[PDB]
Amino acid sequence: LLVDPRYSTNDQEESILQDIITRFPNVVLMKQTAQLRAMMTIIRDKETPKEEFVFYADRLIRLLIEEALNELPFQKKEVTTPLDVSYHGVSFYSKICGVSIVRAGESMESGLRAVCRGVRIGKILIQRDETTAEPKLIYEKLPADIRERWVMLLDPMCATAGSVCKAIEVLLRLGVKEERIIFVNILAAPQGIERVFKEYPKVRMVTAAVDICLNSRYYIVPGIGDFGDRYFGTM
Amino acid sequence: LLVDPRYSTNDQEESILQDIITRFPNVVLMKQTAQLRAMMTIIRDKETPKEEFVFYADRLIRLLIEEALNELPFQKKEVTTPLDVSYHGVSFYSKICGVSIVRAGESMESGLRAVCRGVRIGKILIQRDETTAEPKLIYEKLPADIRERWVMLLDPMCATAGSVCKAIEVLLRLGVKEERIIFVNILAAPQGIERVFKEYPKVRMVTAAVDICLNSRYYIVPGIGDFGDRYFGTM
Amino acid sequence: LLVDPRYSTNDQEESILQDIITRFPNVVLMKQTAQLRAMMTIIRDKETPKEEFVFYADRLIRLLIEEALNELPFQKKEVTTPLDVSYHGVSFYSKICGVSIVRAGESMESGLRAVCRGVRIGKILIQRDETTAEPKLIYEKLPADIRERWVMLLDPMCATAGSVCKAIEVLLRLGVKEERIIFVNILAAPQGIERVFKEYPKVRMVTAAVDICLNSRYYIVPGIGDFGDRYFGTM
Amino acid sequence: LLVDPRYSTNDQEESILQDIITRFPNVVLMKQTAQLRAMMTIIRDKETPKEEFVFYADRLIRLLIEEALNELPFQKKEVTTPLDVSYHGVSFYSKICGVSIVRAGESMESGLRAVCRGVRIGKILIQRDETTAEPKLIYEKLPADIRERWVMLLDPMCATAGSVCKAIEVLLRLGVKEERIIFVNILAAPQGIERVFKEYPKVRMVTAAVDICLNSRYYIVPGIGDFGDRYFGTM
Ligand SMILES: Nc1nc2c(ncn2[C@@H]2O[C@H](COP(=O)(O)OP(=O)(O)OP(=O)(O)O)[C@@H](O)[C@H]2O)c(=O)[nH]1
Ligand SMILES: Nc1nc2c(ncn2[C@@H]2O[C@H](COP(=O)(O)OP(=O)(O)OP(=O)(O)O)[C@@H](O)[C@H]2O)c(=O)[nH]1
Ligand SMILES: Nc1nc2c(ncn2[C@@H]2O[C@H](COP(=O)(O)OP(=O)(O)OP(=O)(O)O)[C@@H](O)[C@H]2O)c(=O)[nH]1
Ligand SMILES: Nc1nc2c(ncn2[C@@H]2O[C@H](COP(=O)(O)OP(=O)(O)OP(=O)(O)O)[C@@H](O)[C@H]2O)c(=O)[nH]1
């Protein structure tokens, strides 16, 4: 909802944002600070060279992952200071794991691995049909006990939501509780958010930015281009 | 009074915070999230092992530094996206540098250097006379043109504010503007904050926690123990 | 082909090692130091925890990548010191890229992105046939100009060499020069080394170790187990 | 004994190395590879920007620190692999700590902390008197039990060896055994190597390069300039 004064906002931005916040109580938008905006301009800029795009993208992913991890359950915990005085804090306890949507999502694996040393990482490779264009599971490698874990579903972009929805579908089938799936995303389109909460209303979604629309080629506008190609350098 | 509901604040902590937020317009407390508490309870725990202590402190410092970098000036900037559409963002201001208060302050250079590659770093070693107990300037190595840049003054703890005030003095005596010093701190005592803004009311302070008071041995309480010792292993 | 005194060698290791060295001019064995051995001990021990496995694996990967990058072409370059005295050095190759064999090979992408900021990364997913057992290309996303580049083929284990050979075959068809392929490998089986070189003799291979054999299920012995499962935690 | 053929060593470098390797048994010279040369030529070039200088310096210091760790004692260890067979490896010595010679040496701390998470870090500030030119101890913060540990002494340069010889002196007066000191260095001069070994013959020295001589102003030549100033950006 809140837009930082510093930067000028793209047309109808403050609007869309509030409307998303109010309509979907399960989405959590990152605080729209100038730093975030600064990083977004660098990664969204056509002109930005690959070494710069992945440095800032990695940088952003970091903030975004710490934001998502805040959606896990926490227990109350008391500890003692070296001063022998009590401090009432909390502790993470959940059994977690991250799951990336092949390629694009893998760029977020390292960010998650940096803060959570050795977190288990699953991988789902989705491919859209050549005829009708219906998502098809091509490959998947998930922890043996994923059904008893909170899942950090990783996918930088959410345009039509067909990929993440299919990903959630199988995740569910293997026994993952819908309300334990935290979908961390970088950039999303309104229609993609509705689609996901229309199908799986219990999941949580933390994004860094919500854009205007999709073009006839399913790309988000103003968007960022193809994140996977830009990040891994397969332009 | 935006303290994450999931945990219980220290006795009379919400009161202290209100006081400071009310009287000191230039202090910026970072968001008191459950995630942040999780980290604090770990490093404040006197049972925590050195490997764990530095890992989390490093982790927290990353978040604190990104927060602090928001206090810098920003230049609106327009960039064209890969979809041939304009995107209104901002641009990073340029003349800045980090200055750490030798030992404890050095632990935050890693973090600054992680997000700001090649950032100029100055050092100032202040030390109290073993008898007289007052702040003496023992050593200092700062960038030749520090007077024309924004200073990110680094020091994890702020108890009496005696050593940071001494630091700002020498910095001012070298021509750096008071309203360009962003004091980034991890943990602070109320009187510490008070003194700082009593003498140098134009600086900015970014902190993650404000404890209740100082004990007979001038230690912040609940506190965290001697940060520099626990961080570098010179227990 | 030489072993460090500190540690005791395995049966016929000094033997197998020299044999591989003299028989194949294009393989390069990392210097067998006590340090390298200490790392192989952590990651080979079935008892080591997942955080410890990835840490040391990542650590070993760094040294192995630096070793492999040495197999690239070099040009002489004279520079001048701040003491205005020339120094004769050598600048490195201008066009490379990494290519990881999906999953296991992906654990190496990070080590490569760490030393070469923004390197282009390709990906190949090979899957054997249940009956034929013949390696099949399932998915591949590669830089568009891979034909004019040197490629660092990434795959930690080389047992039968079937998958790596399948990977070389596709690269070759796309236009990559066989002698510009540098196969970075952690652990290999004599059998796999012979096959790779029997089929593509001009490629170079850098590895940290060579074990004695394969078992009925195609695992190197003493081996390390399933590197992909152990690293990503899907075991 | 080798020197990569790919690059052109400079006038009498091969002679110097020959001599030092013959006359001083305790000096460990990193393998003179083209990769290493390439980095040296980057950081030695007076034209390189601080961002690039820091990056390549950290990278080089990384390889250097791993090399020095090889000088620590190793204990044989047997581990059972996942294949259920034994593997004869080694175990890391368990009592180390890094010690930085304030400012210049602090640049190697991050490298040490990278491979040895949680290593205790001591610091010594030696400053030559502005008139007398005498090396004086200004500040020191070492681990309480440093006498029981092996110390990796950190200082990127060694011109006359007055500073380092002064640091070792204070270390010996504190209890640490002379033979437990591994002096990790990046660049050194024949003079320095001699003095350090004339006075403290039992210390171990690991370095990446040894230049021709010292400048009339006491600078290592061809050299690099002032490493601490180029590293921390205060020049
Ligand atoms: N939830 C959470 N845990 C964190 C975070 N950072 C570090 N951790 C730690 O990482 C752990 C997460 O669980 P896992 O270690 O994946 O649980 P696990 O895989 O069953 O544990 P093992 O069986 O030994 O492998 C917790 O025990 C936390 O202490 C964070 O941001 N969130
Ligand atoms: N202000 C700011 N700059 C950042 C940040 N992250 C990266 N940077 C970059 O780092 C630079 C900071 O400026 P400085 O390094 O002080 O510029 P400088 O010292 O004049 O540069 P030189 O010519 O090399 O000496 C900017 O040019 C930015 O592009 C950030 O969070 N804030
Ligand atoms: N060969 C080599 N180059 C290195 C290494 N470390 C850093 N580099 C630098 O990184 C560069 C490699 O960049 P590439 O990704 O091949 O450049 P590119 O493929 O042409 O792409 P562009 O920047 O767009 O032109 C070289 O120019 C080197 O200066 C290394 O270990 N080996
Ligand atoms: N010698 C050595 N130890 C390493 C290395 N990498 C990791 N380590 C580990 O780091 C430790 C080094 O010893 P320290 O942790 O300083 O020993 P310590 O400080 O007495 O032990 P604690 O008091 O519990 O903290 C060893 O126990 C090793 O297992 C390495 O490259 N060399």
Coordinates of C-alpha atoms and ligand atoms in Angstrom, one line a residue, chain A residues 49-51, chain C residues 65-66 69-70 72-74 91-97 112 115-120 145 149, chain D residues 35 38 42 55-56 59, ligand 3:
Chain A
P49 CA 24.9 -5.9 -18.0
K50 CA 24.8 -9.5 -16.7
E51 CA 27.3 -9.1 -13.9
Chain C
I65 CA 37.4 -24.4 -10.1
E66 CA 40.5 -22.3 -9.7
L69 CA 40.4 -22.2 -14.9
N70 CA 44.1 -22.7 -15.2
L72 CA 42.4 -21.8 -20.3
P73 CA 44.6 -19.9 -22.8
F74 CA 46.6 -16.9 -21.7
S91 CA 45.6 -11.6 -18.9
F92 CA 43.1 -14.5 -19.2
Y93 CA 40.7 -15.8 -21.9
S94 CA 37.9 -13.6 -23.0
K95 CA 35.0 -16.1 -23.9
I96 CA 34.0 -18.9 -21.6
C97 CA 30.8 -20.3 -19.9
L112 CA 32.0 -20.8 -10.6
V115 CA 35.1 -16.5 -9.0
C116 CA 33.8 -15.4 -12.4
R117 CA 31.0 -12.9 -11.6
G118 CA 28.1 -13.3 -14.1
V119 CA 29.5 -16.2 -16.1
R120 CA 26.9 -17.6 -18.5
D145 CA 26.9 -18.5 -28.8
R149 CA 33.2 -20.4 -26.3
Chain D
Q35 CA 45.9 -18.1 -12.9
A38 CA 46.8 -13.2 -13.9
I42 CA 45.5 -7.2 -11.9
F55 CA 37.6 -8.7 -5.6
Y56 CA 40.8 -10.2 -7.0
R59 CA 40.1 -14.3 -4.4
Ligands
LIG3 N1 39.3 -16.8 -18.6 C1 39.0 -16.3 -17.4 N2 38.5 -15.1 -17.3 C2 38.2 -14.7 -16.0 C3 38.5 -15.4 -14.8 N3 38.1 -14.7 -13.7 C4 37.6 -13.6 -14.2 N4 37.7 -13.4 -15.5 C5 37.2 -12.3 -16.4 O1 35.9 -12.5 -16.8 C6 35.8 -12.5 -18.3 C7 34.9 -13.6 -18.9 O2 33.7 -13.0 -19.4 P1 32.8 -13.6 -20.3 O3 31.6 -14.0 -19.6 O4 33.5 -14.7 -21.1 O5 32.4 -12.4 -21.3 P2 31.4 -12.6 -22.5 O6 31.1 -14.0 -22.6 O7 31.9 -12.0 -23.7 O8 30.2 -11.7 -22.3 P3 30.2 -10.1 -22.3 O9 30.6 -9.3 -21.0 O10 28.9 -9.6 -22.5 O11 30.9 -9.6 -23.5 C8 37.2 -12.3 -18.8 O12 37.2 -11.2 -19.8 C9 38.1 -12.1 -17.6 O13 38.7 -10.8 -17.6 C10 39.1 -16.7 -14.9 O14 39.4 -17.4 -14.0 N5 39.3 -17.1 -16.3

